[PDB]
Amino acid sequence: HKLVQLLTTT
Amino acid sequence: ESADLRALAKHLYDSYIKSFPLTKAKARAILTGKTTDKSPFVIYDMNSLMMGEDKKEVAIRIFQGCQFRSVEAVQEITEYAKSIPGFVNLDLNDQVTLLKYGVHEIIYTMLASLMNKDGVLISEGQGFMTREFLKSLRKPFGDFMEPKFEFAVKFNALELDDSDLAIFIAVIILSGDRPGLLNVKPIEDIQDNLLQALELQLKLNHPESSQLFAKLLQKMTDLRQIVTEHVQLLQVIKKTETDMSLHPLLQEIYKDLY
């Protein structure tokens, strides 16, 4: 959830 | 080829410096007073603590301070993981899984960097909270700190520096045995290569340290027990402090963890 957004931010 | 392993080591170390503002080198410098204009405020009692706020009850306030520190750490560790070769090409769900299970192990690993037998640095190194003070905290919070110091003193005796830590951290993140991983093989393949870079790094950086590599691997397993002990203390708190709750990011990392 939050992990996903952190993992895909550039 | 060894040249490649040194380039991997170097890229990991550079990525580490970009992801973690406060390194172990800078922390030991502060702890030993070998830094320029800046000795940290020392928190050792209720009063000391209160003084710090400028520069609920005691135990709860320190607990949540550890939480904000932790949510910050997750973000730094996540950025570092995105710089490990091959990591971003893994199934996004396995990336989440690797992170969910690996993040606190790295937090404790790195937390040792800001600890000596007498206390731990807080808030980017502007403070130093004594070990004796943390031990005076009302149950069950006091036993949250001691086992971390116990691991840290022994971990630090191994004298790993930042360049060592960078590969060590990377090997931990890339564990193919995490629960619920969809594609084990490619994770183990990247880890095998990381392990070869770590072994070479430890041999070149600590040529006289007997069996350092094996000792380090053992610590990786020890970190798991540390987490286990921690989660069970958090279970207590969740159960006996029913009005308390963890920060959102931590709640998401902890749910359905093992």
Ligand SMILES: CO[C@@H](Cc1ccc(OCCc2nc(-c3ccccc3)oc2C)c2ccsc12)C(=O)O
């Ligand atoms: C609540 O535990 C956290 C992990 C964690 C994160 C950070 C942790 O401590 C080191 C830093 C530290 N910072 C503080 C602090 C206190 C007041 C205001 C701001 C900060 O206290 C400590 C011991 C520790 C120590 C034991 S556990 C832990 C978690 O479960 O995510």
